[PDB]
């Protein structure tokens, strides 16, 4: 009855008059001296956490006239192993602080023994099962899950308590991630991806698209990030297939990649080996443990903090032939325990879409320039390199690169986003997008204004905890702020 016989009688205005004047949205002007650099966390240096080595990886290669996924992985691994002479008795150089390093040594020895056993069999199976030795039981987290009981049967246990749900420990930014990105943004001398076929071009637009696609494929196939994409896709595909198929035994999975060298000769390269544990995965976040042992030429003693989770062995010496002559260098093996979930593996098999991202941003960049010249500028864009964009930093000042360099940089950024996924990255990107937009508005002198800038800064900073990738992104944002307001 009250509502039916209700008429508007200055209610809102009276209530607004009654309300205190402290309830207001005061606009804070955003000037060039207003923004401040992001506060990065302090603590021990961050350590490598990728599922495989990226810039320190080493591969044993053999010329094989086979396309991707054609040959038997075990035979390719055996042949690549044969190609190398100069093995040595393993010995521990940099041990895993919290682990049982002798178990890692015995794991490598058992891998070699099983390789020899299959070698002297004259029949290569598609998959090889590894014996459930004590070292592999420990390294793969065998029987580490606490027993599940009813609460009434353990309510009196003295130390029974809720799971640990504290904030992740913080870690400061380490310079090795920038070096990783620089290496991932470089040009390679060998093609890494061979795309499939499509229908014949019938329309002129299809011909223009094919020419531009040839240019883009040439630019992208010779990028280290593409090698990382292919390696990650293969590793995740093999891990998921093994986990679903044989979820009760330890399987030996070689890390293989197929490439084409600048002379046109196909090569199969072996990076290392992966041994998966029991993989009774039920939830999408259920973890399957594996032990990864990867070859490398990098001495861990130069950056020990980068290899906190790794145990490094000396497995041989290699006689590398250089331009001037031959030089002998030690050959190290990085052995560690890692884990992956169904969701992580699934998103690891779709790393190829990363390409699209960069490519799209590149194409729209060319077309926007071609729209105002009425001619396709792609060939003019990156055959004369007339147009350059600021894409780097140097001691002298900002560095500019061609559209090809920009494409490679965006591809590397997408790849690292895929390989370092975490809620921290999501939150930081989402929160820093607003600050980027505010800075852009300031650059367009659109009189930007903020209601609570310190709150936005706190929200951005709360997402920087221990991830090297997000810390590097924050450092990049700080550099951009420094250069975007001078």
């Amino acid at each position: 009855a009250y509502v039916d016989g209700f008429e508007p009688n200055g209610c809102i205005e009276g209530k607004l008059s009654q309300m205190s004047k402290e309830v207001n949205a005061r606009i804070e002007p955003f000037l060039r001296t207003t923004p401040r650099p992001l506060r990065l966390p302090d603590g021990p240096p961050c350590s490598q956490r990728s599922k495989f080595l990226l810039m320190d990886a080493l591969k044993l290669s053999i010329e094989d006239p086979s396309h991707e996924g054609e040959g038997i992985p075990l035979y390719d691994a055996i042949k690549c192993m044969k190609t190398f002479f100069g093995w040595k008795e393993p010995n521990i150089i940099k041990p895993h602080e919290k682990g049982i390093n002798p178990n890692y040594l015995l794991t490598w020895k058992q891998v070699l023994a099983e390789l020899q056993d299959i070698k002297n069999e004259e029949k290569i199976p598609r998959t090889k099962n590894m014996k459930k030795t004590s070292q592999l039981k420990w390294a793969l987290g065998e029987n580490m899950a606490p027993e599940k009981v009813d609460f009434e049967d353990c309510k009196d246990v003295n130390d029974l308590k809720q799971y640990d749900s504290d904030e992740p420990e913080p870690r400061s930014l380490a310079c090795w991630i920038q070096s990783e990105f620089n290496k991932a943004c470089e040009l390679t001398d060998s093609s890494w991806v061979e795309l499939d076929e499509i229908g014949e071009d019938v329309a002129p637009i299809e011909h223009i698209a094919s020419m531009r696609r040839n240019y883009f494929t040439a630019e992208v196939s010779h990028c280290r990030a593409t090698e990382y994409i292919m390696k990650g896709v293969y590793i995740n595909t093999a891990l998921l297939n093994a986990s679903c198929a044989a979820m009760d035994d330890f399987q030996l999975i070689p890390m293989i990649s197929k490439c084409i060298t600048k002379e046109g000769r196909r090569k199969t390269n072996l990076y290392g080996f992966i041994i998966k544990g029991r993989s009774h995965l039920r939830n999408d976040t259920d973890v399957v443990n594996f032990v990864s042992m990867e070859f490398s030429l990098t001495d861990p003693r130069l950056e020990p903090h980068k290899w906190e989770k790794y145990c490094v062995l000396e497995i041989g010496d290699m006689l590398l032939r250089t331009a001037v002559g031959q030089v002998s260098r030690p050959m190290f093996l990085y052995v560690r325990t890692n884990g992956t979930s169904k969701i992580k593996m699934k998103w690891g098999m779709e790393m190829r879409r990363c390409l699209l991202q960069s490519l799209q941003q590149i194409e729209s960049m060319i077309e926007a320039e071609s729209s105002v010249k009425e001619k396709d500028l792609t060939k003019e864009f990156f055959e004369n390199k007339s147009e350059t964009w600021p894409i780097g930093e140097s001691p002298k000042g900002v560095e500019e690169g061609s559209i090809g360099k920009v494409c490679r940089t965006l591809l590397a950024k997408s790849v690292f986003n895929s390989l370092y996924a975490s809620p921290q990255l999501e939150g930081f990107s989402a929160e820093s997008r607003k600050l980027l937009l505010i800075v852009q508005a300031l650059r367009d002198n659109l009189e930007p204004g903020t209601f609570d800038l310190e709150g936005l800064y706190e929200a951005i900073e709360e997402c920087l905890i221990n991830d090297p990738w997000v810390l590097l992104n924050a450092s990049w944002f700080n550099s951009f702020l420094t250069h975007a307001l001078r």
Binding site: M55, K59, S61, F85, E186, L297, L319, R321, A323
Partner: peptide, 24 residues
């Protein structure tokens, strides 16, 4: 089309530590 980079140095990156030549 052969991609190239001005930062590509022909002498500084010796023996390609990632993918070297070791065949005897």
């Amino acid at each position: 089309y052969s991609p190239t980079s001005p930062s590509y140095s022909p002498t500084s990156p010796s023996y390609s530590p990632t993918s070297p030549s070791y065949s005897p």
